[PDB]
Amino acid sequence: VKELLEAGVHFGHERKRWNPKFARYIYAERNGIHIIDLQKTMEELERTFRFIEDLAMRGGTILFVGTKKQAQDIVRMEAERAGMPYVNQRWLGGMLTNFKTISQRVHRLEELEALFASPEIE
């Protein structure tokens, strides 16, 4: 179910345009298309998934990030399917560092959301 599901839809991405560092993950190079190791993937999915579960187990929230076309929706859906913020459009500069500022903008969204369905608008 693992390697089988992943092997039939995962790995074999990029070509020459790699990154020295990302070498301990590379498996082979058949067809100028670097082939990442899946047996080492499950190894990280283990630790990764383990940390994710422990985070949500203690009531932890995760902010998914995915703008690249092929992922926009996948993120929006997979995100809501769990209930947690997520920016698939354009990652504004300061979303984290400038939270107070950026986040403060949210208040406006709520005000307008209620003001639009109010009377004053009449």
Place this chain on the structure above:
RNA sequence: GGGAGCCCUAGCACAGGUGCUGCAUGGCCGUCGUCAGCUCGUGCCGUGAGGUGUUGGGUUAAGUCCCGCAACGAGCGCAACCCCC
């Protein structure tokens, strides 16, 4: 015979100056220019002066608006609120 203004002389303390300096000033005015510009708060960059935002594409009478974007917002301006036709 004392006194209030008040009027006078004489003396005292003071008044007056369109006399100087706009190169000690306030206030008001002109001017670039009704040009569309000039900045700030936090964030990020740089050792620093500073930068970004406000560089770019299209659009407008316009930093007007739109689309982009490590920036997200805001202020003095633009516009609108005032008068005339």
